[PDB]
């Protein structure tokens, strides 16, 4: 004869929302890898990054004499026409974060004193990129070191 419960939250989050979210979520994350970011979400993160990067640059000594600054796609795009170009990303906001290097490249080319094949072999360019990331760690100066 007796009736124990109605459990309105369960009825309202199963009926109105076609799922059962009120469950321990450990079973999902351990068993299944986290889902990738949606296309819409990607646009939002990029907008935030550009503003943050600009601040880091300005309240610090920087050189516009031989450099080029790019705020596009949250990538630094700091390059010199003569010898090289670099593109960066900083995950951190106000808190100081070691400068992170996405890619380092060299712009000098001569086919003939090589031979049909570029001046530096990708092993060495992988090697150079890590060395830079090393000096930056101290991070005394953002763009002068």
């Amino acid at each position: 004869a007796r009736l124990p419960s109605f459990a309105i939250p369960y009825a309202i989050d199963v009926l109105t929302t076609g799922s059962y979210p009120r469950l321990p979520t450990c079973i999902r994350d351990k068993i299944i890898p986290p889902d990738p970011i949606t296309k819409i979400e990607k646009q939002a993160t990029l907008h935030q990054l550009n503003q943050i990067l600009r601040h880091r640059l300005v309240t610090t000594d920087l050189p516009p004499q031989l450099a080029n600054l790019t705020v596009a796609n949250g990538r630094v795009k700091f390059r010199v026409e003569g010898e090289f170009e670099a593109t960066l990303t900083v995950m951190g906001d106000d808190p100081d974060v070691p400068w992170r290097l996405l890619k380092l490249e060299i712009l000098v080319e001569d086919k003939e004193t090589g031979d049909g094949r570029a001046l530096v072999h990708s092993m060495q360019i992988s090697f150079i990129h890590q060395l830079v990331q090393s000096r930056l760690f101290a991070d005394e100066k953002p763009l002068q070191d």
Binding site: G114, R117, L119, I128, L131, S134, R135, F137
Partner: peptide, 25 residues
């Protein structure tokens, strides 16, 4: 069920770079 034999120079520059710019970690 390749190398174009120019690493006998670029290597030297890297050494001159490493000898002049030690890692800071």
């Amino acid at each position: 069920f390749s190398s174009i034999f120019q690493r006998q120079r670029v290597d030297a520059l890297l050494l001159d770079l490493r000898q002049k710019f030690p890692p800071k970690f």
